[PDB]
Write a protein that holds these residues in place. Structure first.
Motif, PDB file in Angstrom:
ATOM      1  N   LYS A  85     -20.982 -49.713 -92.254  1.00 28.51           N
ATOM      2  CA  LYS A  85     -21.237 -50.917 -92.505  1.00 28.51           C
ATOM      3  C   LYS A  85     -21.374 -51.166 -93.869  1.00 28.51           C
ATOM      4  O   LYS A  85     -22.583 -50.950 -94.280  1.00 28.51           O
ATOM      5  CB  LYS A  85     -22.289 -51.618 -91.454  1.00 28.51           C
ATOM      6  N   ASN A  86     -20.622 -52.238 -94.572  1.00 31.78           N
ATOM      7  CA  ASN A  86     -20.765 -52.469 -96.077  1.00 31.78           C
ATOM      8  C   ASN A  86     -21.119 -51.293 -96.753  1.00 31.78           C
ATOM      9  O   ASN A  86     -22.183 -51.315 -97.486  1.00 31.78           O
ATOM     10  CB  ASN A  86     -22.028 -53.602 -95.913  1.00 31.78           C
ATOM     11  N   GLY A  87     -20.287 -50.131 -96.449  1.00 26.39           N
ATOM     12  CA  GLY A  87     -20.454 -48.917 -97.352  1.00 26.39           C
ATOM     13  C   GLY A  87     -21.667 -47.923 -96.843  1.00 26.39           C
ATOM     14  O   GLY A  87     -21.449 -46.953 -97.568  1.00 26.39           O
ATOM     15  N   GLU A  88     -22.228 -48.277 -96.029  1.00 25.56           N
ATOM     16  CA  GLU A  88     -23.538 -47.460 -95.415  1.00 25.56           C
ATOM     17  C   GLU A  88     -23.251 -46.806 -94.098  1.00 25.56           C
ATOM     18  O   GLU A  88     -22.796 -47.575 -93.252  1.00 25.56           O
ATOM     19  CB  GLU A  88     -24.796 -48.447 -95.298  1.00 25.56           C
ATOM     20  N   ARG A  89     -23.661 -45.679 -94.043  1.00 23.70           N
ATOM     21  CA  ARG A  89     -23.108 -44.858 -92.765  1.00 23.70           C
ATOM     22  C   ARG A  89     -24.107 -45.481 -91.526  1.00 23.70           C
ATOM     23  O   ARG A  89     -25.235 -45.816 -91.672  1.00 23.70           O
ATOM     24  CB  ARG A  89     -23.635 -43.420 -92.956  1.00 23.70           C
ATOM     25  N   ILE A  90     -23.286 -45.694 -90.424  1.00 25.95           N
ATOM     26  CA  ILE A  90     -23.753 -46.225 -89.354  1.00 25.95           C
ATOM     27  C   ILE A  90     -24.540 -45.184 -88.538  1.00 25.95           C
ATOM     28  O   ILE A  90     -23.388 -43.974 -88.021  1.00 25.95           O
ATOM     29  CB  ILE A  90     -22.630 -46.981 -88.572  1.00 25.95           C
ATOM     30  N   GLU A  91     -25.817 -44.682 -88.547  1.00 24.53           N
ATOM     31  CA  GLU A  91     -26.319 -43.543 -87.686  1.00 24.53           C
ATOM     32  C   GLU A  91     -25.927 -43.413 -86.379  1.00 24.53           C
ATOM     33  O   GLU A  91     -25.975 -42.285 -85.745  1.00 24.53           O
ATOM     34  CB  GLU A  91     -27.622 -43.676 -88.160  1.00 24.53           C
ATOM     35  N   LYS A  92     -26.090 -44.676 -85.648  1.00 31.13           N
ATOM     36  CA  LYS A  92     -26.034 -44.428 -84.235  1.00 31.13           C
ATOM     37  C   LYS A  92     -24.521 -44.625 -83.812  1.00 31.13           C
ATOM     38  O   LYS A  92     -24.042 -45.885 -84.016  1.00 31.13           O
ATOM     39  CB  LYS A  92     -26.857 -45.482 -83.450  1.00 31.13           C
ATOM     40  N   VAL A  93     -23.911 -43.670 -83.291  1.00 29.85           N
ATOM     41  CA  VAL A  93     -22.438 -43.809 -83.018  1.00 29.85           C
ATOM     42  C   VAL A  93     -22.577 -43.114 -81.664  1.00 29.85           C
ATOM     43  O   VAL A  93     -22.444 -42.177 -81.432  1.00 29.85           O
ATOM     44  CB  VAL A  93     -21.334 -43.567 -84.089  1.00 29.85           C
ATOM     45  N   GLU A  94     -22.115 -44.105 -80.573  1.00 27.75           N
ATOM     46  CA  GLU A  94     -22.752 -43.566 -79.152  1.00 27.75           C
ATOM     47  C   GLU A  94     -21.638 -42.922 -78.601  1.00 27.75           C
ATOM     48  O   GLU A  94     -21.901 -41.924 -77.754  1.00 27.75           O
ATOM     49  CB  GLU A  94     -22.844 -44.689 -78.215  1.00 27.75           C
ATOM     50  N   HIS A  95     -20.284 -42.718 -79.317  1.00 26.63           N
ATOM     51  CA  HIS A  95     -19.030 -41.887 -78.486  1.00 26.63           C
ATOM     52  C   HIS A  95     -18.631 -41.151 -79.396  1.00 26.63           C
ATOM     53  O   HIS A  95     -17.865 -41.715 -80.491  1.00 26.63           O
ATOM     54  CB  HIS A  95     -18.167 -43.063 -77.846  1.00 26.63           C
ATOM     55  N   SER A  96     -18.264 -39.932 -79.326  1.00 27.69           N
ATOM     56  CA  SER A  96     -17.237 -39.024 -80.042  1.00 27.69           C
ATOM     57  C   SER A  96     -16.811 -38.015 -79.284  1.00 27.69           C
ATOM     58  O   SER A  96     -17.307 -37.018 -78.814  1.00 27.69           O
ATOM     59  CB  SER A  96     -18.221 -38.205 -81.205  1.00 27.69           C
ATOM     60  N   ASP A  97     -15.395 -38.413 -78.935  1.00 22.04           N
ATOM     61  CA  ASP A  97     -14.624 -37.859 -77.943  1.00 22.04           C
ATOM     62  C   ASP A  97     -13.469 -36.812 -78.813  1.00 22.04           C
ATOM     63  O   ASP A  97     -12.402 -37.524 -79.351  1.00 22.04           O
ATOM     64  CB  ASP A  97     -13.881 -38.743 -76.939  1.00 22.04           C
ATOM     65  N   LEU A  98     -13.753 -35.482 -78.613  1.00 22.88           N
ATOM     66  CA  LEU A  98     -12.861 -34.686 -79.143  1.00 22.88           C
ATOM     67  C   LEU A  98     -11.731 -34.061 -78.217  1.00 22.88           C
ATOM     68  O   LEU A  98     -12.239 -33.672 -76.987  1.00 22.88           O
ATOM     69  CB  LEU A  98     -13.519 -33.609 -79.915  1.00 22.88           C
TER      70      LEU A  98
END
Length: 100
Positions: free
Chosen positions: A42-55
């Motif tokens: 978001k505006n070049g800054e990492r979004i720390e909370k990403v609720e879904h990571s499906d591999l």
């Protein structure tokens, strides 16, 4: 050995059961090896909370990652996905087109 550069798609979706909700998605596809680093920005800054990571994988040598989370975009903000992989000598940043 085989190595394959990920394809990277960045897009937004509203779940039809909860249409006011909006999710930012980074779909990272067809890559090998599976080692990878993926961030939403978001505006070049990492979004720390990403609720879904499906591999997942299809063939033993083709991996797929859907990395997504709820967001509340405004017309002035810039969103993106940043991917690091052995095939990418520099991190690859793919901007969200806000009409996607």
């Amino acid at each position: 050995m085989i190595q394959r550069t990920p394809k990277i798609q960045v897009y937004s979706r509203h779940p039809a059961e909860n249409g006011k909700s909006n999710f930012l998605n980074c779909y990272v596809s067809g890559f090998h090896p599976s080692d990878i680093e993926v961030d939403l920005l978001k505006n070049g800054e990492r979004i720390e909370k990403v609720e879904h990571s499906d591999l997942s994988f299809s063939k033993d040598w083709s991996f797929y990652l859907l990395y997504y989370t709820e967001f509340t975009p405004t017309e002035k903000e810039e969103y993106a996905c940043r991917v690091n992989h052995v095939t990418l000598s520099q991190p690859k940043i793919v901007k969200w087109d806000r009409d996607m």
